[PDB]
Amino acid sequence: MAMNIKELSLHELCEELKTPAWNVPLTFVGDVGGTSARMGFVREGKNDSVHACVTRYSMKRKDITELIEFFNEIIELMPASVIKRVKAGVINVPGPVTGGAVGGPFNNLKGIARLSDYPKALFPPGRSAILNDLEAGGFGVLAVSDAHVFSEYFGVMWEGTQWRTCEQEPAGSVIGRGRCLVLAPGTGLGSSLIYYNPMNQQHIVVPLELGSQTIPMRKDIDYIQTLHAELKLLPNYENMVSGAGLEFHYRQVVRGSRPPCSAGEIAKLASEGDANACKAMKKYHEYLMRVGSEASMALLPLTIVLVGDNIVNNAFFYRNPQNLKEMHREALNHEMERLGFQSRVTYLRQKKLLNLNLMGCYRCGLDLS
Amino acid sequence: AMNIKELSLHELCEELKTPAWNVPLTFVGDVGGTSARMGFVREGKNDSVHACVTRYSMKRKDITELIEFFNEIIELMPASVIKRVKAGVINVPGPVTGGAVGGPFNNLKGIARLSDYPKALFPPGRSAILNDLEAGGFGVLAVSDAHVFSEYFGVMWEGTQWRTCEQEPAGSVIGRGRCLVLAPGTGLGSSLIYYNPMNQQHIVVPLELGSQTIPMRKDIDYIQTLHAELKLLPNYENMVSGAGLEFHYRQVVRGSRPPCSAGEIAKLASEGDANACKAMKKYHEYLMRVGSEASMALLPLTIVLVGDNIVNNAFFYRNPQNLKEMHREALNHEMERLGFQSRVTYLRQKKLLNLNLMGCYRCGLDL
């Protein structure tokens, strides 16, 4: 198995790291959310495989600075001869970062993440970084490709016209050298651009805020104006492509005929074949394809990849050939499709669960060491 | 400290035989639809940059004619001069793959092939073909590197983020952050100069922001008027172009006055013509919308307006009423309730300089 993540108690992780398979160079990684952080060590295995061993920490204090207590505990317990093998340290945090070194402020945690405050044993000077969540997720998409298992984690929705002229291998078998736009449609709408720099021979991940752009119209001015009047804000893409957005689409389908439902209730009903909930899901995806059509022009990506547990869990929607045909039509609904811009782009969806952020911390670390 | 001199081919040959030019050289070329400017760049004191170039007519409208120009320069130039060329980089008005294969082109026949160029002007591992947008962004980096950003760029307004990561004045350097380059000219070019915080590297990423569908503000009727004329949903370049300015002038007059060209409109505005000034306000209103939306999408530290058109229209930006109205539209975004649009420092090119030629040079320093 190419991508392996094992969760252990700190004491069991210490025992695991003394085993012979772990007597190799190590990367320290940390995936930090509002409730818990998973932190530990990653090594290479056979055939560019990835093996992580992590421990779950509760963010009891809802303070980012508590991470320093967790780091200090790992360095106190672990033999110095084991920690000596760490060549890089990278964590992801749910908020903005400057200089790859200063994270926050955060919506759901107090304090600021400061790399210069972290122990050099786990964060070697010059070989360390703090990443935003969706930067780490981009690097995680790269990590899957590098481990030769893109076709295990991602499914092709449709192959674009540019793939075969730019790449030798089948669509969806590798990320491709071209620009890759990562979209994370979930409760919100995350975005990042994976760029390959030919001069460097280095891939870099550019975090974006595509979801906060004002929605440009097609033939839907009355639909956008309905949401405008409700929010008292000109709609952005996240307003239509979010849990709140899906709840709105469901209200507009049923027009008071049926009780209001949560985003989770709507997804479940669509999965059970409820016509109203399926229509609401079509509307959600119509606006996701608008982000995609406009970014296809602005950013000239080779590929668009939809990531996240939400995308995996909603596989039923993407597997339906009618739904996929309607999504493809809206992806090509742009004036510049007369010149083939939108049809150039290959669309892919995550089809298997994976902690992309932990794998991305590792992949970023390889650039740094 | 940045110097580009235009010469005849004969004068260029004589200049390159003088002692100031007995130093390593970069061969550069800025190729457009009508003409190309090509020649040689050297370093001087204090990271200064000195170029000497000649104009070629693209008579045949054929990109392969460049090879005849290259062969003519090698025939004419002493072997001692050509020997000093350590790198060769040209820019072309179309897509490039592998930094080696340019085109097809909208306005020229044939394909630009670096493999077909003479190694005397394009030494191995030290040569490239660039897209024009990429060259322009490298050019912005070249100005900053030569310490003369404050000579070539004027601050329109300083945003909140500059002093949080730079102690020197706004406009003194490109800045350790993303720089969005807009080139509002006949059309509207765009590139993102990404900043990689982990290695302090700027990386030029060409974009197509001009081709995005315009999102509305309170202007649905105005967008629909242009829609009905073009039979296309308007994009930003439709409003921010020569053709766009001409449209804005038609809408201002409301049939009172006949059409004028983009050039005539700018001249009238410089003379204080109220109608032409209103046309220019509308043009800049849509330019600031590209800016407000990209300020959110791309989180730039700076937006820099570049090109001969921007320099030649400096009157418009020096009028404080015009500048205040542009600043208001730059902040006309829902996300400005969280300060996003206010973060960004806006600058305009205020002195003529071929950024494409400078970017060919700067790209060579990265090769």
UniProtKB/TrEMBL annotation, chain A:
Superkingdom assignment: Eukaryota
Pfam families: Glucokinase
Molecular function via GO: ATP binding; D-glucose binding; glucokinase activity
A GO biological-process term: glycolytic process
EC number(s) stated in the UniProt entry for this protein: 2.7.1.2
Keyword list, A-Z: Kinase, Nucleotide-binding, Transferase
Keyword check for Hydrolase: no
The protein's enzyme class: transferase
Coiled-coil residues: none
Annotated residues for binding of ADP: T187, N310, N314
PANTHER family for the chain: GLUCOKINASE (PTHR47450:SF1)
Name of the protein this chain belongs to: Glucokinase 1, putative
The species this protein was found in: Trypanosoma cruzi (strain CL Brener)
Source lineage: Eukaryota, Discoba, Euglenozoa, Kinetoplastea, Metakinetoplastina
Automatic annotation (TrEMBL), chain B:
InterPro entries in UniProt: ATPase_NBD, Glucokinase
Entry annotated with the keyword Transcription regulation: no
EC assignment: 2.7.1.2
Entry binding sites for ADP: T186, N309, N313
Entry protein name: Glucokinase 1, putative
Keyword Nucleotide-binding: yes
GO molecular function: ATP binding; D-glucose binding; glucokinase activity
Xref: Pfam families: Glucokinase (PF02685)
Keyword tags: Kinase, Nucleotide-binding, Transferase
GO annotation terms (biological process): glycolytic process
Record CDD domains: ASKHA_NBD_GLK
